[PDB]
Design a protein around this ligand. Structure first.
Ligand SMILES: Nc1ncnc2c1ncn2[C@@H]1O[C@H](COP(=O)(O)OP(=O)(O)NP(=O)(O)O)[C@@H](O)[C@H]1O
Ligand SMILES: [Mg+2]
Length: 332
């Protein structure tokens, strides 16, 4: 009666859950909506993300993570349980082997609490791994080889960079300059340069639709809808990709600096691997147009943009199944 393997990518922006024999059962926003002042969940995932900034007084929004850190442990615990309910499997936790991948900013205290909760739910084994380690494996690097894997993971709450070798993280660092920061800067820029008020939904759509870090073959622009800063009256304006590219390049100076900082702290034998083989890039922001060109021009090493940039962590978790199963056989 093989034990069920359950894997959870717990992320600031999105979370993914996988159950062996079922595949991915959840791949949606890390957001919940409750009837205000009650325990009644009214939305989870994408339906809850849509409610952000669009609620009335009797709906409120909770997010288990903010900038890679747990906001409220009970909220995080309930979120995990609601994710598991999406499986439609009775007693899904019972006798299960659970792998949770989470940001480094989740404390050991919070990790142990998640372990104990899943154990309370029926799990026979619970292990917690750093998202950066799983991302590199899922994005295709042999993290187990004695060889330096150079990873950059640009998410919503955090950007992390590190060197991986021989099954573990050798050195790493995370910064707050990531997707959420970028979209807030676009919002601020639009107000400052176009004297128009927009929200974060529009700023993110600008970033996804016309954002770039290098001039592409295609010139793009956008019409956006907002309110005049002066009159509060309805207003629409055109945003050019060139003005957003200038902004993104300036913002990404902190991200190139992070990559340089990792290299400067890389042990010398591993640094030759990082330089010769180059950078592996994952996370949702790895999809920004021209990122590869931007990084290759600056660093003059190969840059691989993961083809699975948002499922890299869960895919690593799935690849890590034998390793987690061997930890249970051996704990006997
Ligand atoms: N096509 C896209 N182009 C650009 N950015 C995108 C795209 N799709 C998603 N994003 C951004 O990717 C970010 C989320 O990446 P993702 O790896 O799913 O985050 P996460 O793992 O939940 N957050 P974190 O805990 O910081 O790693 C958000 O800032 C999105 O706006
Ligand atoms: Mg992530």
């Amino acid at each position: 009666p093989p034990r069920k393997f359950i894997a959870i990518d717990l992320g600031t922006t999105n979370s993914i859950a996988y159950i062996g024999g079922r595949g991915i059962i959840y791949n949606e926003a890390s957001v919940m909506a409750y009837e205000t002042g009650t325990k009644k969940l009214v939305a989870l995932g994408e339906d809850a993300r849509k409610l952000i900034g669009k609620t009335h007084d009797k709906i409120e929004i909770y997010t288990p993570l903010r900038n890679g850190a747990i906001t409220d442990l009970r909220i995080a615990e309930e979120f995990i349980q609601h994710i598991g309910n999406r499986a439609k499997v009775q007693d899904v936790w019972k006798g299960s082997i659970v792998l949770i991948a989470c940001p480094k900013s989740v404390t050991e205290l919070e990790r142990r609490a998640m372990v104990e909760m899943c154990k309370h739910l029926g799990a026979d084994l619970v292990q917690v791994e750093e998202d950066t380690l799983m991302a590199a494996l899922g994005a295709g690097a042999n993290i187990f080889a004695p060889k330096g894997t150079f990873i950059l993971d640009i998410g919503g709450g955090k950007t992390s960079a590190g060197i991986i070798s021989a099954g573990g993280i050798v050195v790493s660092k995370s910064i707050k300059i990531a997707g959420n920061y970028i979209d807030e800067e676009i919002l601020k820029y639009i107000r400052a340069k176009h004297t128009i008020s927009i929200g974060v939904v529009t700023a993110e759509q600008i970033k996804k639709q016309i954002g770039s870090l290098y001039k592409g073959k295609e010139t793009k622009k956008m019409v956006i809808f907002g309110r005049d800063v002066v009159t509060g009256m309805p207003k629409e304006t055109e945003i050019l990709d060139s003005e957003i590219r200038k902004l993104l390049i300036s913002i990404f100076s902190s991200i190139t600096q992070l990559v340089t900082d990792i290299l400067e702290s890389t042990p010398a034998e591993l640094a030759g691997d990082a330089v010769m083989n180059g950078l592996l890039v994952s996370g949702g922001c790895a999809q920004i147009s021209g990122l590869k060109e931007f990084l290759e021009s600056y660093f003059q090493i190969p840059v691989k943009i993961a083809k699975n940039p948002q499922t890299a962590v869960i895919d690593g978790c799935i690849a890590y199944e034998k390793e987690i199963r061997d930890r249970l056989i051996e704990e006997n």
